[PDB]
Amino acid sequence: GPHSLRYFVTAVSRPGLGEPRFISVGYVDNTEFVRFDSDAENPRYEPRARWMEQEGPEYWERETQKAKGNEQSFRVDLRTLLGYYNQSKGGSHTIQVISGCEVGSDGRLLRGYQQYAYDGCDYIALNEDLKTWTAADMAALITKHKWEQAGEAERLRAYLEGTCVEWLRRYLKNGNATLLRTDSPKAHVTHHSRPEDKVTLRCWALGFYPADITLTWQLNGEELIQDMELVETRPAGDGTFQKWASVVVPLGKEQYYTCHVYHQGLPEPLTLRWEPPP
């Protein structure tokens, strides 16, 4: 299906503590494959996914120098923004960027990204047409006018449709087998007491991958999406994910409810019910 290559970059100023902390993370289909962290005696891009060690020492040297170059630009950018927003040199600020492309199953570009944020708020972004810019505030307008004059949008469109896509194709074919990895969830229902004549049924989905999943509770075949609680999907820490959804039901009516688990790893959705140990 549709795939993507994106870099999530962060620069955080640390006045009075040292140089800004600079981090660049590369993703292929929401999976981290490379990372550069300036917090090292000799920082360099490092592989984060096995299939990347297939690249030669020339690739890493080049990427590393490019990241060191961006670290410098961001260092300057942090100073520039202190001016644009009339802020002191004693506070910590953050600059973030999401740069990348998404392609279709035919390998062609579906959309490119290049968006900035200052202290957690949108700053400037390249529009879908890949020619114009959307500034978030007055400070961003100064940047917009510079980039419009220098033809920055044109430079990015060339990178997005060319370099970005070409390398994504290369990556996708090197990690395809790994990227298509699938781990089905194992589910079960737990029973918990509630004040008075009610009880809670909690449906667990454990050890699945990727994180995308849907859990539902039905009462006699109808989906119950109102008074149903659920937690955000969370990492188990071993590469797989967890999630649960619960509903409060009348004591003695547990058999009227069924849990449904939908995940791309399953041959078909899982259907479960509370099972009192015989």
Binding site: K66, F74, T80, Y84, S99, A150, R155, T163, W167
Partner: peptide, 8 residues
Amino acid sequence: SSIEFARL
């Protein structure tokens, strides 16, 4: 591969 960012 990443792109070299322009300055703000």
